[PDB]
Design a protein around this ligand. Structure first.
Ligand SMILES: Nc1ncnc2c1ncn2[C@@H]1O[C@H](CSCC[C@H](N)C(=O)O)[C@@H](O)[C@H]1O
Lengths: 255, 255
């Protein structure tokens, strides 16, 4: 939540001047999770806007957002952007935003067709997503191991679709062009983030981890996962810091 | 070097239409004094240009080229873009080209202000350089061993200056502004390259390796360097194929 939080802010600084909102714009954010990043996003949108609808596949995250982060301008909804859109949303939106979400979506063409179908004419789309990452690579090392590999077979659906692609900016631009977008700008960025608390970090690994292993093996599984960061030598053992690289892709496009 | 070569193509193919030459262009190339990449330039170079001066730091490499290589519209000059230019070359060039070289240049600011000086008014520059790489990262693992650490003191200067920076596009753009370039476009790229046979890859690592070890220990040092690729798990032992990742930056700038 702190990696994506700073990336959210980083991305909206860099692209603030480039992102245009018509007067009284309907904005839809996808992947609002708990809504603490939805709120930061909201403080960066123009006052003029009519609606920020924030969406997540996670019904429990959407409920927490309603309880805590609601105001007269925002509403929340359970929505799978890989699934079929509800009729009343089709064509209603001036601006579509998705920060650090689309790397969780395996069906990229389907999802981008649904972004398109959501937008009114001259809609702008603004996305950020991971390709390569040192975090993912930690999981890839784990999956090689004789012990943990049998429980890590859904690995490709967890990794960014762009983890091992050459020129993912151009693969994305192609999908977008093909779906029917215009003014397609895809830009790749190399990011570095430094963790200062190794206890907090192990917690985030347990948090990001999607593989089910036997309960009795779970502490060992996580121990070996923490060893993969020592293997890549991205832990600094004296000063208790972990600094990890990840590639970001920023998408800006219009209907 | 097939890395450098396959970068050259993708670079110039993705940026050909955008790269502008005038009639009678005086063109300077900074890299290796192998006409290999000068040939692949020539397809993307317009036919009406007057001169191509292809320079390199390496005395032996120039001597060999002017001896053996033969395009009559091509000269070879020993030049160091980290050193102080000869007065005869200042102001004299309409296009500067350097593919996959500037990652070897620690004094980045000195080098871009030399590229600035070599141009005439309205001159254009085209650079590609490496930031983060699995190849670099392999050497970083080696550097951290008790046996080899001592022989690998000079890692800062061997690694790209951008190996571990967040957003090298912004760092490069700033230095370009500060030297006085205009219409500054810097794009980062996530690239992947697959070696088909691992003896050609052992070839390249001896190629790029700058550190001196005792001649009786050298086969042990490279063997241990090859092991780091099994540690990162970028070798597929079933096919004898190694896939690895490298971040690059493409600079397009006008004087
Ligand atoms: N297909 C899909 N449709 C909608 N939400 C999805 C989705 N796939 C994943 N998500 C949700 O998107 C979120 C991505 S986690 C990132 C949180 C937030 N976007 C941020 O910038 O911090 C998760 O809550 C996940 O449940």
């Amino acid at each position: 939540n702190d990696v994506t939080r700073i990336d959210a802010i980083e991305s909206l600084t860099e692209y603030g001047s480039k992102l245009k909102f018509k007067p009284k714009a309907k904005v839809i954010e996808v992947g609002c999770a708990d809504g603490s990043v939805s709120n930061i996003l909201f403080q960066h949108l123009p006052k003029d806007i009519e609606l920020l609808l924030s969406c997540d596949k996670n019904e429990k995250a959407v409920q927490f957002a309603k309880e805590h982060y609601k105001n007269n301008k925002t509403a929340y909804r359970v929505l799978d952007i890989e699934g079929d859109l509800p009729e009343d949303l089709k064509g209603k939106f001036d601006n579509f935003i998705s920060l650090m979400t689309f790397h969780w979506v395996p069906q990229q063409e389907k999802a981008f067709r649904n972004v398109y179908d959501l937008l009114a004419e001259d809609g702008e789309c603004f996305l950020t997503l991971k390709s390569y990452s040192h975090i993912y690579h930690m999981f890839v090392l784990q999956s090689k191991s004789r012990k943990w590999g049998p429980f890590m077979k859904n690995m490709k659906n967890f990794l960014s679709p762009y983890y091992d692609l050459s020129m993912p900016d151009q693969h994305i631009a192609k999908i977008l062009k093909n779906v029917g977008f215009k003014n397609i700008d895809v830009r790749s960025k190399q990011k570095m983030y430094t963790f200062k608390n190794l206890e907090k970090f192990r917690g985030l690994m347990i948090g990001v981890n999607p593989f089910k292993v036997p309960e009795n093996e779970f502490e060992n599984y996580i121990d070996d996962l923490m060893e993969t960061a020592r293997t890549l030598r991205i832990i600094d053992e004296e000063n208790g810091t972990l600094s990890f690289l990840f590639n970001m892709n920023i998408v800006h496009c219009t209907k």
